Amino acid sequence: NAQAEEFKKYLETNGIKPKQFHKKELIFNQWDPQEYCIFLYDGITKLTSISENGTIMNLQYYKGAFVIMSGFIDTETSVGYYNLEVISEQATAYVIKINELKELLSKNLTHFFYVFQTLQKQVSYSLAKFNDFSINGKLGSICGQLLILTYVYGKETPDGIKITLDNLTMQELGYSAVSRIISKLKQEKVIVYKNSCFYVQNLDYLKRYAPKLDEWFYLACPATWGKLN
């Protein structure tokens, strides 16, 4: 995004520098009382919650460029006990204490609005995910995840649309009730495992079962959506 590049310049102009993280690192964590604004510039992360018995809940995936805030902009207190875990091999992020951010959002309104609109994109993402699950259950969820991966990481090859992700990252994303759905899908030549990669061969099927996420992508990321429509 150009809006993302301008935000990066704005931060680096104000002496906030990028930080590199490696896979499994927590950019912020649920036990930390200091809250942050993360500008995820590059890489893939997941928002988790860890219960007292140790079970890890995967709540949300984010890719750069995006903004993730662990605290409320006004109170500076936590919005939820969450970790931001790196799942790509490396990720680059700008890490801003929440108080320090208020100063900088204020001087510039273009950049205030860039962060505002990322929140709006998150809200409508969650509602669309929910709408697709209410209609089509787990098939909807899984079709939705494959759809966004196709739009974002897909590449045209003679074998279909290849999802061009490191095979290690694919494992981090989930690639017994899920086992059976992924089975039906290749069982119907919607997806295929060739060359140890992952190819989509019936993109219309994915659009059919994740209609509201498809609409979200159209409305919120139209230039990308347009590559495959």
- With CB under 6 A as the contact rule, the residue among 63, 102, 218, 228 that binds ligand BY8 is 63
- Residue 47 as a binder of a copy of itself (CB under 8 A): the answer is yes
Out of 28, 62, 175, 199, the only residue in the binding site for ligand BY8 (CB under 6 A) is 62
Q: Which does 193 bind (CB under 5 to 8 A by kind): ligand BY8, Na ion, a copy of itself, none?
A: none
Residue 128, number of CB atoms within 10 A of its CB: 21
Sign for the pseudo-dihedral over CA of 151, 154, 157, 161: negative
Q: How far apart, in whole angstroms, are the C-alpha atoms of residue 151 and residue 161? A: 10
| Secondary structure of the chain in HEC code, one letter for each residue | CHHHHHHHHHHHHCCCCCEEEECCCECCCCCCCCCEEEEEEECEEEEEEECCCCCEEEEEEEECCEEEECECCCCCCECCCCEEEECCCEEEEEEEEHHHHHHHHHHCHHHHHHHHHHHHHHHHHHHHHHHHHHHHHHHHHHHHHHHHHHHHHEEEECCEEEECCCHHHHHHHCCCHHHHHHHHHHCCCCEECCCCCCEECCHHHHHHHCHHHHHHHHHHCHHHHHHHC
Binding residue (CB under 8 A) for a copy of itself from 59, 168, 186, 189: 59
Choice from 1, 12, 80, 195 touching a copy of itself (CB under 8 A): 80
Report the residue number, 102 or 192, with the smaller CB distance to a copy of itself.
102
Pick between residue 106 and residue 110 the one whose CB is nearest to ligand BY8.
Answer: 110
Number of residues that bind ligand BY8 (CB under 6 A): 16
Interface mask (CB under 8 A) for a copy of itself, residues 104-143, using x and -?
A: -xx--x--xxxxxx-xxxxxx-xxx-xx--xx--------
Residue 116 engages ligand BY8 in binding (rule: CB under 6 A): no
Residue closest to 66 by CA, chosen among 93, 102, 105, 99 = 93
212 binds, among a copy of itself, ligand BY8, Na ion, none (CB under 5 to 8 A by kind): a copy of itself
- Residue among 58, 108, 122, 131 that touches ligand BY8 (CB under 6 A): 122
Instruction: State the residues that interact with a copy of itself by CB under 8 A.
Output: 3, 47, 49, 51-52, 57, 59-60, 69, 72-75, 77-82, 102, 105-106, 109, 112-117, 119-124, 126-128, 130-131, 134-135, 211-212, 215-216, 219-220
Instruction: State the residues that interact with ligand BY8 by CB under 6 A.
Output: 44, 60-63, 66, 121-122, 125, 145, 148-149, 152, 173, 220-221
